[PDB]
mmCIF file with all atom_site columns, C-alpha atoms and ligand atoms in Angstrom:
data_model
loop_
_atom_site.group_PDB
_atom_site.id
_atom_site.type_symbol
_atom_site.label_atom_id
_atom_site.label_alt_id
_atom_site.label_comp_id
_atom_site.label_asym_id
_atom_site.label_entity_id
_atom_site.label_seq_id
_atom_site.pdbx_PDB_ins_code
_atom_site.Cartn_x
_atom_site.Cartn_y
_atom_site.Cartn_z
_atom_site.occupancy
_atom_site.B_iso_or_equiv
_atom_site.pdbx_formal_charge
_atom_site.auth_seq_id
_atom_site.auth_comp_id
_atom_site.auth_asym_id
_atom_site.auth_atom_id
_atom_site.pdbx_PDB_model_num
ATOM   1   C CA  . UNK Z 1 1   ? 83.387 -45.837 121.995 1.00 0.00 ? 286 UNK Z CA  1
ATOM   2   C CA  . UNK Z 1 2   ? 82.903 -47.327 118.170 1.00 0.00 ? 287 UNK Z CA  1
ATOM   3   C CA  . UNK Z 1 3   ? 84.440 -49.240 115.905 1.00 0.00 ? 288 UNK Z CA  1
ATOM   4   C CA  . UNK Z 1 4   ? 87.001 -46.577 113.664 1.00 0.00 ? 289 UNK Z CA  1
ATOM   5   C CA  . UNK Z 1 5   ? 90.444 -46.956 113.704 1.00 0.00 ? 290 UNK Z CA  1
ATOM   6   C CA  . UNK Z 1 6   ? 93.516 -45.506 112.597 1.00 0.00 ? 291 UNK Z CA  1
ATOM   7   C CA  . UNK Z 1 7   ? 92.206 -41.479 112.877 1.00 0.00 ? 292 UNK Z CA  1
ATOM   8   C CA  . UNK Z 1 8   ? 94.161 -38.619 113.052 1.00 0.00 ? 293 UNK Z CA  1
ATOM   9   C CA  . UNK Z 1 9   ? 92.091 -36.087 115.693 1.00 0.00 ? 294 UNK Z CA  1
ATOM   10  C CA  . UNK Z 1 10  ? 91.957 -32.687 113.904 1.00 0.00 ? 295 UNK Z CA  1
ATOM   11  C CA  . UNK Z 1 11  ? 89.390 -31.138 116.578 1.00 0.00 ? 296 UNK Z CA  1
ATOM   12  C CA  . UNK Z 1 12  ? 86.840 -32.057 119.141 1.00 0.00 ? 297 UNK Z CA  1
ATOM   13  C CA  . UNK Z 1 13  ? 84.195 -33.778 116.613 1.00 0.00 ? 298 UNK Z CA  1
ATOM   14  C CA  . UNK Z 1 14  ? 86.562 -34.369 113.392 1.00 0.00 ? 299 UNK Z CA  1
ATOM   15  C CA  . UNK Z 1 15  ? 88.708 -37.006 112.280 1.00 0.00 ? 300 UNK Z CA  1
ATOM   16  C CA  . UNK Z 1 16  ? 90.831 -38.560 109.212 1.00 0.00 ? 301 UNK Z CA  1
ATOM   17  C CA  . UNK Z 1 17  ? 92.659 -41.028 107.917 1.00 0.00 ? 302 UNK Z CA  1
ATOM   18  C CA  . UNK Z 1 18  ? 93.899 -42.148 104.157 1.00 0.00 ? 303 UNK Z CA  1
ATOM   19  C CA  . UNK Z 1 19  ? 91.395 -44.730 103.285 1.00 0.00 ? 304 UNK Z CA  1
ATOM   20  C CA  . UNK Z 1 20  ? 89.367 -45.862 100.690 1.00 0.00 ? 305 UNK Z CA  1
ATOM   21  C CA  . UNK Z 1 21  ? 85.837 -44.814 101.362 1.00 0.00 ? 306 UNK Z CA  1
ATOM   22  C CA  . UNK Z 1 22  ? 84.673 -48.526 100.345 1.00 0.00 ? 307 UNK Z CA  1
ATOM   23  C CA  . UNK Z 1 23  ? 86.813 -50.076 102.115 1.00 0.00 ? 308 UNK Z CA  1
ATOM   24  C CA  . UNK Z 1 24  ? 86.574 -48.119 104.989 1.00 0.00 ? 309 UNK Z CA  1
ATOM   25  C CA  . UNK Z 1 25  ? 82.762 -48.924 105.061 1.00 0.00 ? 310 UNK Z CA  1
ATOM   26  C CA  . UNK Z 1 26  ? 82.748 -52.244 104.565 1.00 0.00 ? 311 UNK Z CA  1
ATOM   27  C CA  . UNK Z 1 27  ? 84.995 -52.763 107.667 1.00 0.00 ? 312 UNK Z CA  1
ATOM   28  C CA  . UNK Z 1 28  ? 83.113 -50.676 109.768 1.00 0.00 ? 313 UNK Z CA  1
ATOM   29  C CA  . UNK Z 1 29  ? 79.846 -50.782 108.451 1.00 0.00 ? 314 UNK Z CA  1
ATOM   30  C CA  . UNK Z 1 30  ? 78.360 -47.167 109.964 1.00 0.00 ? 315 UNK Z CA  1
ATOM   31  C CA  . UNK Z 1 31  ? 75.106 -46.322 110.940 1.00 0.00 ? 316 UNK Z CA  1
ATOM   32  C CA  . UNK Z 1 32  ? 75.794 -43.665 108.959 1.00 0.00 ? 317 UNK Z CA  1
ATOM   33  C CA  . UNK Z 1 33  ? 78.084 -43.091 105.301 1.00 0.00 ? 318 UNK Z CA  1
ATOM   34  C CA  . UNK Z 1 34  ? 77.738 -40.684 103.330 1.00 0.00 ? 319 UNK Z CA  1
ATOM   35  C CA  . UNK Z 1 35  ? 77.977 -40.158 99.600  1.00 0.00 ? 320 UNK Z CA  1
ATOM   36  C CA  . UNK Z 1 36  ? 79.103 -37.151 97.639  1.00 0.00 ? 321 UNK Z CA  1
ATOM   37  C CA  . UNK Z 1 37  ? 75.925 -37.610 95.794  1.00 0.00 ? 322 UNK Z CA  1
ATOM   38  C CA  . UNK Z 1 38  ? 74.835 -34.596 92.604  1.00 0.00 ? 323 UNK Z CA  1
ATOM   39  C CA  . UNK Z 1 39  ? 70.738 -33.299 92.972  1.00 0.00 ? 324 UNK Z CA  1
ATOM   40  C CA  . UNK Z 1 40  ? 70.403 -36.477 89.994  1.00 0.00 ? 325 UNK Z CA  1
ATOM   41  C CA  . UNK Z 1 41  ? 71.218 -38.969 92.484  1.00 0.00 ? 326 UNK Z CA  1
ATOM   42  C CA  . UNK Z 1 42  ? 73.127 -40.132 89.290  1.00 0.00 ? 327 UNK Z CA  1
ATOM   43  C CA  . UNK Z 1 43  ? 76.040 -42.662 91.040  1.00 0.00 ? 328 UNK Z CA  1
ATOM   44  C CA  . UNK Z 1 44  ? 78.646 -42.692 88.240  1.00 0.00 ? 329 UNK Z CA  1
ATOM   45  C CA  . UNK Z 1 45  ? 81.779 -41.838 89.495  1.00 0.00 ? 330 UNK Z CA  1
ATOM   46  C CA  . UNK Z 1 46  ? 84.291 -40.340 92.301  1.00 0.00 ? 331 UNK Z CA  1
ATOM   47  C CA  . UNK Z 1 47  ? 82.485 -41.394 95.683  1.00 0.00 ? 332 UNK Z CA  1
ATOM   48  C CA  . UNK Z 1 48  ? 78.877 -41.801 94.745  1.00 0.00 ? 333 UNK Z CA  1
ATOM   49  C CA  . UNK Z 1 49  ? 79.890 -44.486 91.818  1.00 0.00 ? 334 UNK Z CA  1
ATOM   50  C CA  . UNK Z 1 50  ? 82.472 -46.274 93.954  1.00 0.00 ? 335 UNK Z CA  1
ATOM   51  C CA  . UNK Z 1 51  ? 79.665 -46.894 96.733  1.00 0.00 ? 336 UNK Z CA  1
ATOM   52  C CA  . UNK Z 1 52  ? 76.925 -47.854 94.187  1.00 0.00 ? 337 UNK Z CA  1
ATOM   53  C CA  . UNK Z 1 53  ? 79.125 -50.238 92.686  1.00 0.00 ? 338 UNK Z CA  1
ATOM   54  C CA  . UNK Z 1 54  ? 80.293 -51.825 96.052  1.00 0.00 ? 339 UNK Z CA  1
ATOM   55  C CA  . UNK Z 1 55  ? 75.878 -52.177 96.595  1.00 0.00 ? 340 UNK Z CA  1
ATOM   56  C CA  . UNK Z 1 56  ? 76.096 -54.185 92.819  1.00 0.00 ? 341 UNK Z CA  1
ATOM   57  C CA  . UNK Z 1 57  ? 73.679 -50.976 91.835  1.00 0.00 ? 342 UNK Z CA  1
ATOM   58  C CA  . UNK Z 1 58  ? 71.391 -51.800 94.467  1.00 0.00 ? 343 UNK Z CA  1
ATOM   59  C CA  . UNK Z 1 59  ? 72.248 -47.789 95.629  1.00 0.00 ? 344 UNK Z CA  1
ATOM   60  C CA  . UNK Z 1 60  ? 71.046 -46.825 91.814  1.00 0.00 ? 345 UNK Z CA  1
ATOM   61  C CA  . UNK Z 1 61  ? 68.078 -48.303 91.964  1.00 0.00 ? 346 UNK Z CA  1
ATOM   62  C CA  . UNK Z 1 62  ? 66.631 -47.091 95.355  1.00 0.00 ? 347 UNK Z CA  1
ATOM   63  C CA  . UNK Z 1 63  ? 67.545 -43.611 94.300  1.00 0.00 ? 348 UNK Z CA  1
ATOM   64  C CA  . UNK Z 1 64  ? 66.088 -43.923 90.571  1.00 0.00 ? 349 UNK Z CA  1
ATOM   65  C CA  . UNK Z 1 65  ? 62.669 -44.700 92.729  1.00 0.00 ? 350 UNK Z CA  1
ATOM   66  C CA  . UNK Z 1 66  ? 63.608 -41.674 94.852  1.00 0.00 ? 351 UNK Z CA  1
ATOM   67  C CA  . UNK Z 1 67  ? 64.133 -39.428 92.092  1.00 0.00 ? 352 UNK Z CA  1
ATOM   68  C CA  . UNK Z 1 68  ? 60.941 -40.332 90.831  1.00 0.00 ? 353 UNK Z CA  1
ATOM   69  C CA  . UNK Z 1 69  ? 58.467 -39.806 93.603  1.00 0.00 ? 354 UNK Z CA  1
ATOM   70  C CA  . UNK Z 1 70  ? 60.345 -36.999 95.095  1.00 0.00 ? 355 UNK Z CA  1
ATOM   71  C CA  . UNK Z 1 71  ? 62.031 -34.926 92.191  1.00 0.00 ? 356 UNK Z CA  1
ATOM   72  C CA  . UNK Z 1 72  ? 65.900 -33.304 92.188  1.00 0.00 ? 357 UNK Z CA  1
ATOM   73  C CA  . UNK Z 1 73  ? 67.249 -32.449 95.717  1.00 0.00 ? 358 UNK Z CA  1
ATOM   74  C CA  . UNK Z 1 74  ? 68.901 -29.161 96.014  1.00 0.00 ? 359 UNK Z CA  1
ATOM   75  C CA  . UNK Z 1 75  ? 72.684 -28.016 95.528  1.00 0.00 ? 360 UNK Z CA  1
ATOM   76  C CA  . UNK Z 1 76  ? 73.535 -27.889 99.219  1.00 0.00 ? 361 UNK Z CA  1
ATOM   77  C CA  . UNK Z 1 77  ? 70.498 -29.969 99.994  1.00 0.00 ? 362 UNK Z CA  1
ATOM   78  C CA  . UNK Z 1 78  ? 70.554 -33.811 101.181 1.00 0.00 ? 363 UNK Z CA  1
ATOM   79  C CA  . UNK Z 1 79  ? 68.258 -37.058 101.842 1.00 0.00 ? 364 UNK Z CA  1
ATOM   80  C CA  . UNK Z 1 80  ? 68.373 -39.982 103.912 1.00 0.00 ? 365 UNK Z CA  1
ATOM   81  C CA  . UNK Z 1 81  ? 68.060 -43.648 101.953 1.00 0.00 ? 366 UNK Z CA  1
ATOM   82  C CA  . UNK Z 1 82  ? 69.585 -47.317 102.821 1.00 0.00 ? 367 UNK Z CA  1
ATOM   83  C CA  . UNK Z 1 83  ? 73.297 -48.298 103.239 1.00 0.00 ? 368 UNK Z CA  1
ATOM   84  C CA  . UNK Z 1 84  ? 72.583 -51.109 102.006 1.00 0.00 ? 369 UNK Z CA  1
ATOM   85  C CA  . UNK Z 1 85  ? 75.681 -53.671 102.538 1.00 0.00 ? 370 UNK Z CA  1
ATOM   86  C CA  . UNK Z 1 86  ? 77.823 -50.724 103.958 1.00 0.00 ? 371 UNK Z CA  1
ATOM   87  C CA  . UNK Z 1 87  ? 76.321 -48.994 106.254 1.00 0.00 ? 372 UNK Z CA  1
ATOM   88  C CA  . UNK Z 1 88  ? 72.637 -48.803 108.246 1.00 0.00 ? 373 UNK Z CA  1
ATOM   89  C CA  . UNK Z 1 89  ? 72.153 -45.418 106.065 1.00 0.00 ? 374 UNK Z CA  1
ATOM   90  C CA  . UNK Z 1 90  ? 73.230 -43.562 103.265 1.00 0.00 ? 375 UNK Z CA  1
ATOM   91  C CA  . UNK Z 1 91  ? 73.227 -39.925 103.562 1.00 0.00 ? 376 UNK Z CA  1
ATOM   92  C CA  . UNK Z 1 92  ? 73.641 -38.337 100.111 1.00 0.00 ? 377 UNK Z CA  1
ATOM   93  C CA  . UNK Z 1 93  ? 74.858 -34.915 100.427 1.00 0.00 ? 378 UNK Z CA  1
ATOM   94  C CA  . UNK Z 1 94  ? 74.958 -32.453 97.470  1.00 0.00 ? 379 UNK Z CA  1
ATOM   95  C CA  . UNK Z 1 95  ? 78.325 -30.378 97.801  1.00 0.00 ? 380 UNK Z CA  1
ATOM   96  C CA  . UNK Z 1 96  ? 78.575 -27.762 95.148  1.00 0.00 ? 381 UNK Z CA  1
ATOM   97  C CA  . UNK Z 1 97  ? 80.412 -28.530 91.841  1.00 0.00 ? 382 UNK Z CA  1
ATOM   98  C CA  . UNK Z 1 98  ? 82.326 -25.837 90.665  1.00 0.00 ? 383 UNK Z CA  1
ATOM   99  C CA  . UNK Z 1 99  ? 82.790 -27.401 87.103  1.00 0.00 ? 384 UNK Z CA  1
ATOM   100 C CA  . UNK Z 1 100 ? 79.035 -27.024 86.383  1.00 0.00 ? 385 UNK Z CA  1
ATOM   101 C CA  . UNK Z 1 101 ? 78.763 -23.552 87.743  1.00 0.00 ? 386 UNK Z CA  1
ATOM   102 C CA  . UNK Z 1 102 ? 77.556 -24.330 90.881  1.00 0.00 ? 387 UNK Z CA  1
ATOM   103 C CA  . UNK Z 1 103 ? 78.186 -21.863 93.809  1.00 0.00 ? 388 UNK Z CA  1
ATOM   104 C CA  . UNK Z 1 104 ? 81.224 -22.352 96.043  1.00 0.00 ? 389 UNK Z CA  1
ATOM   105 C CA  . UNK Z 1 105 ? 79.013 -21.114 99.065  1.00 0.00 ? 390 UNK Z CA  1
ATOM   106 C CA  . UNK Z 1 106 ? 76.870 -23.919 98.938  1.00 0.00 ? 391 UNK Z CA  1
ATOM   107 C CA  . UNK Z 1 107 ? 79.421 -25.633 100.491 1.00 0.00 ? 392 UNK Z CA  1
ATOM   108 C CA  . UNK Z 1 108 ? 78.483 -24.712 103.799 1.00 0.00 ? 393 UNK Z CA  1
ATOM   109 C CA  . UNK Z 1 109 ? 74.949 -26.062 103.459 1.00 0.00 ? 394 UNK Z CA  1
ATOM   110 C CA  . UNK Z 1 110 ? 76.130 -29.189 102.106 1.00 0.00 ? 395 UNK Z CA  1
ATOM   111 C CA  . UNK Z 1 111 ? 78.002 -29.602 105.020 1.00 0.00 ? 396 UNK Z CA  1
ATOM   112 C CA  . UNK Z 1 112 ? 75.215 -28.457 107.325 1.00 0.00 ? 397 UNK Z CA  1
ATOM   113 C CA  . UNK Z 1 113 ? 73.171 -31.452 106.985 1.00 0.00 ? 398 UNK Z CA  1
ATOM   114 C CA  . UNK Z 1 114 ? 75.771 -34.097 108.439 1.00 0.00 ? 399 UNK Z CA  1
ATOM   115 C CA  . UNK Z 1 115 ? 74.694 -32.261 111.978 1.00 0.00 ? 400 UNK Z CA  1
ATOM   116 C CA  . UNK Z 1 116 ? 71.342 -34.138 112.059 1.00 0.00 ? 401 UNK Z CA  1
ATOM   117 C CA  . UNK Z 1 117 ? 73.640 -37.165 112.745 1.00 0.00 ? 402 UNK Z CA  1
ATOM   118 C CA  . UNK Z 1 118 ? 75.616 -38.191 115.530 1.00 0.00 ? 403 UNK Z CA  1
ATOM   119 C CA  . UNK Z 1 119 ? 78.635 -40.056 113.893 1.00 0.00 ? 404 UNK Z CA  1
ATOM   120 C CA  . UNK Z 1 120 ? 79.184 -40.329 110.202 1.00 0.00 ? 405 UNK Z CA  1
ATOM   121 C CA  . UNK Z 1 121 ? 81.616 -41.744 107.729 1.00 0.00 ? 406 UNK Z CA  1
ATOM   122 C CA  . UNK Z 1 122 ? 82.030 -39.664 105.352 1.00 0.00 ? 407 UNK Z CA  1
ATOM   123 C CA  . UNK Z 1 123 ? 84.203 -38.352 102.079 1.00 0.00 ? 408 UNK Z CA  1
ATOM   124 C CA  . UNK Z 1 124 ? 85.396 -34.191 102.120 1.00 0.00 ? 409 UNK Z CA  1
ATOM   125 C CA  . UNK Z 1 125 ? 82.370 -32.964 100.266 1.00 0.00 ? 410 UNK Z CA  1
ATOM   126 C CA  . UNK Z 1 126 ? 83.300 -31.211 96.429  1.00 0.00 ? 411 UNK Z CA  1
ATOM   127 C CA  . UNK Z 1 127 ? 86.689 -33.030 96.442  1.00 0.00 ? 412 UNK Z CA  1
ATOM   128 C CA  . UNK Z 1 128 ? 88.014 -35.378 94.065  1.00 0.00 ? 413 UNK Z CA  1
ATOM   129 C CA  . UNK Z 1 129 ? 86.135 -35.326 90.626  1.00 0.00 ? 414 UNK Z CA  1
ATOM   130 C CA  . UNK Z 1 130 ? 83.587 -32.136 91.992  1.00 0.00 ? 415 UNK Z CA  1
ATOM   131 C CA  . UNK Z 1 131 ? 86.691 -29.911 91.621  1.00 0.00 ? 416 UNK Z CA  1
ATOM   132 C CA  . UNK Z 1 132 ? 87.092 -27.844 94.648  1.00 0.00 ? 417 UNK Z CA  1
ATOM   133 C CA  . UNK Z 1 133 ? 89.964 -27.935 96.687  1.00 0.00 ? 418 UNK Z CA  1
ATOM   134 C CA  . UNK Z 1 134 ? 90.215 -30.263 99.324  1.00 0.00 ? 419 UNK Z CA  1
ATOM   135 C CA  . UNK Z 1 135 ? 91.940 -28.514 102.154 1.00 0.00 ? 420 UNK Z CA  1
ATOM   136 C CA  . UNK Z 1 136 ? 89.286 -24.886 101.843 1.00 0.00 ? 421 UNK Z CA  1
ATOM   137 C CA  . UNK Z 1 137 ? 86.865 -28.074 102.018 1.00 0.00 ? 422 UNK Z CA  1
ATOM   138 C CA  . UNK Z 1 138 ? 88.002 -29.413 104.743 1.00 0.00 ? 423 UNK Z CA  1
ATOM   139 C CA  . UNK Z 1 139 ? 88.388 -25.567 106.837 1.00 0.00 ? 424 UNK Z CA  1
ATOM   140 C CA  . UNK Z 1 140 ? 84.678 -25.520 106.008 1.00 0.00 ? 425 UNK Z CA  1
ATOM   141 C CA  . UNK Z 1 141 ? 83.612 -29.169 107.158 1.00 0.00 ? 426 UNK Z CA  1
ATOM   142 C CA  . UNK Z 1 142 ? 85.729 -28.340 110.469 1.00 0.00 ? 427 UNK Z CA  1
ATOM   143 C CA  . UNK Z 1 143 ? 84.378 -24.916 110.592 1.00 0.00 ? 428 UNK Z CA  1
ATOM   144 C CA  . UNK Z 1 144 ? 80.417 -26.573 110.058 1.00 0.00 ? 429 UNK Z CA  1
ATOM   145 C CA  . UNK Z 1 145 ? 80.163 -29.636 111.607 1.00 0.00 ? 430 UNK Z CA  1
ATOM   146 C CA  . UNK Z 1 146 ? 79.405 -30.328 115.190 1.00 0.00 ? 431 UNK Z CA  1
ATOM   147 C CA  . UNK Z 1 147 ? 78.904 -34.050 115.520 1.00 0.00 ? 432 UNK Z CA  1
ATOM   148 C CA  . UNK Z 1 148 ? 81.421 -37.121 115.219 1.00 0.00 ? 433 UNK Z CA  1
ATOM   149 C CA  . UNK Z 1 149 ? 82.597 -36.952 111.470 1.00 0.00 ? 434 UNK Z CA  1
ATOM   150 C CA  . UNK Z 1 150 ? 84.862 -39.638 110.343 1.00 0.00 ? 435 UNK Z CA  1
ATOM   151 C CA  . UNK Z 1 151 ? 86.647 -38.356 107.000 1.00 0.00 ? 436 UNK Z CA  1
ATOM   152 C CA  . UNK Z 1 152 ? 88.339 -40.628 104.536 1.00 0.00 ? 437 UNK Z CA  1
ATOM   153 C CA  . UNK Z 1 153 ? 90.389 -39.217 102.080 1.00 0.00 ? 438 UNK Z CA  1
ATOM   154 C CA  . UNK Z 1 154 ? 91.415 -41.564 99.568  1.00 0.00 ? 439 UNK Z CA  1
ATOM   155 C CA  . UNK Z 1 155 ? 94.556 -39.747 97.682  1.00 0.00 ? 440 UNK Z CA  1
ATOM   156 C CA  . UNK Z 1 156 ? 97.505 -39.935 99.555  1.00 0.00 ? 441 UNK Z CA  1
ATOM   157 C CA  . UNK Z 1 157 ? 99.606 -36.673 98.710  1.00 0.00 ? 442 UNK Z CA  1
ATOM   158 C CA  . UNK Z 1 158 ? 95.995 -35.021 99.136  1.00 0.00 ? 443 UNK Z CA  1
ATOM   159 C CA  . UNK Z 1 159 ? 95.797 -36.382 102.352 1.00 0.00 ? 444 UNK Z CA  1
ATOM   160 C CA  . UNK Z 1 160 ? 99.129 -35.610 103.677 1.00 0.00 ? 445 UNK Z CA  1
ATOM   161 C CA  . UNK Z 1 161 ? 99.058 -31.891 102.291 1.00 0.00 ? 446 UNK Z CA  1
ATOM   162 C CA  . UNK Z 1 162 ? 95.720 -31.531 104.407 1.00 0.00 ? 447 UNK Z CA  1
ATOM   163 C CA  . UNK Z 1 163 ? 97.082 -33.120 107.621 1.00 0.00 ? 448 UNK Z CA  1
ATOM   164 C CA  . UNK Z 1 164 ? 99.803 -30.623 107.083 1.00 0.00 ? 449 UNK Z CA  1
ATOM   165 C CA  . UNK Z 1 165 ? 98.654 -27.684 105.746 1.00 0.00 ? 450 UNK Z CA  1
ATOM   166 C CA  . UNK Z 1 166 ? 96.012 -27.092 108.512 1.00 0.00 ? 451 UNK Z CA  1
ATOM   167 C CA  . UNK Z 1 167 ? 95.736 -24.599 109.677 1.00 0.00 ? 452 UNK Z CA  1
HETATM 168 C C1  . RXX X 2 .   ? 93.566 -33.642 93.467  1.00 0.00 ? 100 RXX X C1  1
HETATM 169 C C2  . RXX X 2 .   ? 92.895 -34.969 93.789  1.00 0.00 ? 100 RXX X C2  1
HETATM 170 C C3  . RXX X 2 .   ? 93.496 -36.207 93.963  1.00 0.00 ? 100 RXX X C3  1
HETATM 171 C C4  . RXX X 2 .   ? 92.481 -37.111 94.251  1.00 0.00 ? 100 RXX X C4  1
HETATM 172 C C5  . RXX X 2 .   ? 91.285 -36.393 94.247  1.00 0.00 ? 100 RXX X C5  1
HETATM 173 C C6  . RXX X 2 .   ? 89.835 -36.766 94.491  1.00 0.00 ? 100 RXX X C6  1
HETATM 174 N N1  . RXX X 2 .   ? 89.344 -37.458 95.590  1.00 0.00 ? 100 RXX X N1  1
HETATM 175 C C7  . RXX X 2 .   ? 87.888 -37.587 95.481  1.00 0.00 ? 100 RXX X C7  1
HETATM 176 C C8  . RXX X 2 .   ? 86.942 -38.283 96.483  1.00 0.00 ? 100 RXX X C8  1
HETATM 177 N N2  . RXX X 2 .   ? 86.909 -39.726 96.269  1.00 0.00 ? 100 RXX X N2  1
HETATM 178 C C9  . RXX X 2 .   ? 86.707 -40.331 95.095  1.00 0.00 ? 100 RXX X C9  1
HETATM 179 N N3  . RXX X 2 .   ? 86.731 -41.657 95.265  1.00 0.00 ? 100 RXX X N3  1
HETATM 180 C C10 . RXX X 2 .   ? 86.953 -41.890 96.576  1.00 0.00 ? 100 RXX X C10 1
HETATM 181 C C11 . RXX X 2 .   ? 87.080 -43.041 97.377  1.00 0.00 ? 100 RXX X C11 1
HETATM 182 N N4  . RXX X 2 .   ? 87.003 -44.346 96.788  1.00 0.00 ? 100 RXX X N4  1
HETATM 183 N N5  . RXX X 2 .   ? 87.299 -42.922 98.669  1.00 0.00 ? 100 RXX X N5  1
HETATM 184 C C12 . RXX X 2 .   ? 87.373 -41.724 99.216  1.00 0.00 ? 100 RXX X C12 1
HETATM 185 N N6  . RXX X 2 .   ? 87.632 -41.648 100.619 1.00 0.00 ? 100 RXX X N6  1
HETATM 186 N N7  . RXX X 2 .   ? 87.273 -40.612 98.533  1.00 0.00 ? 100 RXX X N7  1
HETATM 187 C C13 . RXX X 2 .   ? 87.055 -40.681 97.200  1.00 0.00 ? 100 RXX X C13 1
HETATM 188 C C14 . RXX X 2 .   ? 87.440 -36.921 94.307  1.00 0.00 ? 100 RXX X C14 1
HETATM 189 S S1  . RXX X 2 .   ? 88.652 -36.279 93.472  1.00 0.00 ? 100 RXX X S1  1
HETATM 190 O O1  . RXX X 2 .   ? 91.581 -35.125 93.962  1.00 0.00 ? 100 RXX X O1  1
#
């Protein structure tokens, strides 16, 4: 038992609710959010720039350092850094985005990595302003992961077209 509220149970392991990813995280405060990062670990909008912000760029700067010992991570590809005020970790996760050519069968992979984690807070990965579609996301994130995911989606009519379109 944890501290999430409010879910709607799609499966065994995967939940949702309308909410603010923020929000949601400063209210819970995870071990374990994750951010809808790019391989730049360059926090300037959708999820990623929303989370930075609510760190007052603390999140940019311990990724800047990142980026510079470590290089790029990989389109599909993930690392582990500090949640800061939000959470006990930030997991950024690289889900494809198809408006810089990026392959839509990454998607998978990105999702892949949220199973070295037992229960996560987490945003549908390539949604919002990394242009795929957020249901076909969300059949691959239910289709992928086998631990506890908590998913916030923060539009509402996306939201309720995913709770009912599911398939
Ligand atoms: C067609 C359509 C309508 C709305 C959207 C998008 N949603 C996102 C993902 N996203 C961005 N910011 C947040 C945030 N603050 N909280 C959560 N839970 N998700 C977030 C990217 S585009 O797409």
């Amino acid at each position: 038992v944890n501290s999430f509220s409010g879910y709607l149970k799609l499966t065994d392991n995967v939940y949702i609710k309308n909410a603010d990813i923020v929000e949601e995280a400063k209210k819970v405060k995870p071990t374990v959010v994750v951010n809808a990062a790019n391989v730049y670990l360059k926090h300037g909008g959708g999820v990623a720039g929303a989370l930075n912000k609510a760190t007052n760029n603390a999140m940019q700067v311990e990724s800047d350092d990142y980026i510079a010992t470590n290089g790029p991570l990989k389109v599909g590809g993930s690392c582990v850094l500090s949640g800061h005020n939000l959470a006990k970790h930030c997991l950024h996760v690289v889900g494809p985005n198809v408006n810089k050519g990026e392959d839509i069968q990454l998607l998978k992979s990105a999702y892949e990595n949220f199973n070295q984690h037992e229960v996560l807070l987490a945003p549908l990965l390539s949604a919002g302003i990394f242009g795929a579609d957020p249901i076909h996301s969300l059949r691959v994130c239910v289709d992928t992961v086998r631990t506890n995911v908590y998913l916030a989606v923060f539009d509402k009519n996306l939201y309720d077209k995913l709770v009912s379109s599911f398939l």
